[PDB]
């Protein structure tokens, strides 16, 4: 009984509403909010030239030991809310400070292009 794979999406793709409700995804960003009482995390990423927010629900990854200010990769399912923002329901929330972010992003791009070229 296996979940779908955590497909890589850039955070500004999640932000812009480009991932369908119910998709399973990996994304990334700097942890800028953790509120345990409301089980909420916000991940942030810059992209030419705005800030982009990814809302994360931490219920399944509690007890969560936050490194606020650090880079994370979240793995989970995206869910529409009625009617604030779409939230990622995390199944995995991993601290990756100091990953080489632009290299990650290139690896994601190369992976996608290869799939497309096949």
């Amino acid at each position: 009984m296996l979940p779908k794979p955590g497909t890589y999406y850039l955070p500004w793709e999640v932000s812009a509403g480009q991932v369908p409700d119910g998709s399973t995804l990996r994304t990334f960003g700097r942890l800028c909010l953790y509120d345990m009482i409301q089980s909420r995390v916000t991940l942030m990423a810059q992209h030419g030239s705005d800030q982009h927010q990814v809302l994360v629900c931490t219920k399944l990854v509690e007890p969560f030991h936050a490194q606020v200010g650090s880079l994370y990769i979240v793995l989970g399912e995206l869910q529409h809310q009625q009617d604030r923002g779409s939230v990622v329901k995390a199944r995995v929330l991993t601290c990756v400070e100091g990953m080489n972010l632009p290299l990650l992003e290139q690896a994601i791009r190369e992976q996608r292009l290869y799939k497309q070229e096949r």
Binding site: P5, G6, V92, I108
Partner: protein, 141 residues
């Protein structure tokens, strides 16, 4: 002859050779032994083995990892509570098997990877397209 580094998605859908069972085919390349890296997303324990659901961003597959067996004093009680869990990164080298209409990897070797800055996983993500272009997507021999 090697442990072939492949996308989990290809492992899940490569056709099996009728002539030689347990051998699977990618573009005329005979594949048996594989090398996967991904996130543990499920854990099931039985008496003789662990079942680890592994997610590499292209697919999810169960890897059957057979249990083994100072030594009990220095190590074992520490081994005891450093067990693989959901969220860990693991590497699994083994054979592709079919069992009860499901495809699985039967591990020859498996270990938790320490990948604190995503170094190993980024390198794997970058390497795979190249192995496909140079080897798997090229006519077999």
């Amino acid at each position: 002859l090697a442990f072939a580094k492949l996308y989990i998605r290809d492992i899940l859908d490569m056709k099996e050779s009728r002539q030689v069972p347990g051998v699977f085919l990618y573009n005329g390349h005979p594949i048996k032994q594989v090398d996967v890296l991904g996130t543990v997303i499920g854990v099931r324990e039985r008496d003789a083995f662990y079942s680890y659901g592994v997610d590499d961003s292209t697919g999810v597959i169960n890897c059957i990892c057979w249990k083994k067996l100072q030594l009990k004093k220095l190590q074992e009680t520490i081994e005891q509570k450093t067990k693989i869990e959901i969220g860990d990164t693991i590497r699994v080298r083994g054979s592709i098997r079919t069992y009860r209409e499901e495809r699985e990897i039967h591990a020859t070797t498996y270990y938790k990877v320490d990948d604190p800055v995503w170094n190993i996983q980024i390198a794997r993500m970058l390497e795979l397209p190249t192995i496909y272009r140079k080897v798997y997507d090229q006519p077999f021999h």
